[PDB]
Symmetry: C3
Subunit: 307 residues, 3 copies
């Protein structure tokens, strides 16, 4: 695959060099030709990307997204010179779709611990912000929403990388606990702050899943860190308390209810699987099971006014 992706890069390079030639010579039919070329690239690239997400290779998907960005960049240059609304609508649609797709991939990359690809994904996301910002600087709230999602992902990377460093460095389980506790608290305060300004339903849905995936990664790494059953329990309880409190902000609707549910259920499943793997006695399994059930009871009772 990669060489075909690089042929798209060469076509986009030739289009960009052609777009300098069009800026210098002024032929509107040359702008039409590079617009057609860039759409054909955009098709080829989206086909490779939709294949890549079915195949599960995130590196290929991120390469394809960066090509979609590069194609969107020259489309934005053509739209900036020509003033054509069809190109502006296409670029906005493609970029908004790419933002959602890269967000899904970023959730995957953080949830699967492949933070190197997540860093590349955030890099691509910044370029998507450049595309969106060049497309409409006045329609600012969508940029503010994207930047909030980015700040949330950055906060998740800060917690993730701080803990990954601590995992390499072999610190005491009590230091690992206090760092994870501090991390989950800081994540709560950031989620609370973001929830002041955001209002896109899908953005809130994304944000909750990101908070959940960050907590899940923190617990999985802490458990791979060989912590005591007592640490595993206290951290799981704190994580349930966070997931519950952030759900009491975000659980506005059937989707956000079902999302908070699936997340708390996933956290319970993970907690129990780790308690089984360490061989913790049945009372700790009961205590965690109760905490999970009681959290879902609280959320479904709390949300019962909204439906």
């Amino acid at each position: 695959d990669d060489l075909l992706l690089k042929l798209l890069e060469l076509l986009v390079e030739q289009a960009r060099v052609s777009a300098e030639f069009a800026r210098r010579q002024g032929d509107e039919k040359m702008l039409e030709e590079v617009a057609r070329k860039a759409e054909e690239v955009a098709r080829k690239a989206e086909s490779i990307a939709r294949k890549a997400r079915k195949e599960g290779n995130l590196e290929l998907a991120l390469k394809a997204l960066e090509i979609l960005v590069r194609a969107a960049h020259v489309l934005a240059e053509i739209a900036r010179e020509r003033g054509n609304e069809e190109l502006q609508k296409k670029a906005h649609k493609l970029a908004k779709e790419a933002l959602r797709q890269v967000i899904e991939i970023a959730i995957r990359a953080i949830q699967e611990g492949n933070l190197e690809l997540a860093i590349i994904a955030l890099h691509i996301s910044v370029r998507i912000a450049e595309v969106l910002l060049e497309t409409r600087p006045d329609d600012r709230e969508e940029i503010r929403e994207q930047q909030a999602i980015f700040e949330l992902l950055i906060a998740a990377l800060e917690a993730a990388i701080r803990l990954e460093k601590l995992k390499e460095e072999g610190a005491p389980p009590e230091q690992i606990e206090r760092v994870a506790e501090h991390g989950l608290e800081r994540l709560k305060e950031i989620a609370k702050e973001i929830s002041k300004e955001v209002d896109s339903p899908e953005s809130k849905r994304i944000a909750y899943k990101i908070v959940a995936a960050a907590a899940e990664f923190l617990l999985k790494i802490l458990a791979e860190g060989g912590a005591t059953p007592e640490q595993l329990e206290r951290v799981t309880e704190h994580a349930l308390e966070v997931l519950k409190e952030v759900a009491k902000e975000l659980a506005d609707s059937p989707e956000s209810g079902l999302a908070a549910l699936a997340a708390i259920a996933s956290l319970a499943k993970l907690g129990l699987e780790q308690l089984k793997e360490i061989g913790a006695p049945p009372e700790q399994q009961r205590r965690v099971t109760k905490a999970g059930i009681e959290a879902v009871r609280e959320i479904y009772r709390y949300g019962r006014k909204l439906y």
Copy 2:
């Protein structure tokens, strides 16, 4: 070796920052210094490029050409501010010969099957086009010749990498043959479209050599794909037929005949070598030889009208 080339890069970038300093300070002698330093880079880079021309390390050749591009770019900025012709005369000639040389390297890379370096080279060629169009935006025929050669090389790379992907997937011989046939058909039609505009004699030789190298790569890949002796024979005759058709559609001098028919005979020799290696019965070897000799007769009987 590469560290030498990196010292040239550091020299060029120091010159480039010195050319920002020259744009801010206005000193003619500073422009004269960076111009001289860039010619000293051109000396050093040309010298290593001649070494690579002998030794066949294409990666070094491309690296040296990239330095020649970088040097030409700063020379173009120096000359565009200073208004001097001699730096533009040097840049134009150096770029034109570098374009031919990188095309010859790219033909070699396609013939060797290192499409990775060929892609990198084609990017360098597109960057030579940035130098060319910055040198003059109205020298359009040279830019058109470059773009035509580029699109031919891309069409060849698309056919090549598609068929190599069929080799990686383990596709059936009949599908492999339909893709190879489609590739030759598309190449023939593109070459006929290009023949409506191009008028550099060496560019016509380049185009024929590219079509021939693409057919050669297709033949070698189809042989590695394990196609039957009958399919190899049908491909060989169809390929020679296309090569004969393209030879008639391009050739316009006895020297162009010498080149084209030498290339045809080379492809026929490879076809015979493949049938010999596969152990195909002598009647198939005769059939291919007859087709080759009939192409010789036809291109003789056509070519004797050009002279």
Copy 3:
């Protein structure tokens, strides 16, 4: 550690797009926010860099320095566009601190022979020059100090890589010694020319250390080349002779004296250790030791003119 460093890169890219956004909206509050965040990035990177200085991992230090320069770019954009002199001051200070640090690191990299990192460092030094040049293009004396040091480093690296290339391709020790003498003479000429312009004590400290490290590299490379004791003596005397002459130029003060002799003594100690390791006879050990003591006797005699 590279995850943390790349996290800082993402913070910087997010800030850079935020600095596009702040220039599109026209609000100083976001410029304060990116300035704050960039200063925290600078503190984080500086902390990692001084840590890397203690650990001895030059690749991490150079990565961190490039991040400091990347942060300095967005800081310089804010300090240029908002016009706040306290940002200009903090940027200029950070850039000058980085310049000294990267020069000392580059001297270390040359002294250890890891010239790949020295090339990267010198690239970063070009980036520091971009920051300095954008900060104040009329600060011409500081710019000239950086240029002179750069020219010296480039000349030293040219000799170094010429000699390493000669070792890599193979040569008779006679040609290696003839190149080494030509290198020491080029170093003498360039150092003499630079010493006509430069005045700063830190610049003297840098310059002599670089010349000394270049002689040290030349000597250690001839030792890796396995040259006979006669060639080792001949280069040792000529190298001490150049170091003595360059000391007679640069030794303006007790500090520059102290440096020059410490370096000379080190070069002699290396020379005697190579005579010890190659098993040179006791009379040759004495002859070289006497020559070294006579160089000390000359640094004593000459430097006392300024006591």
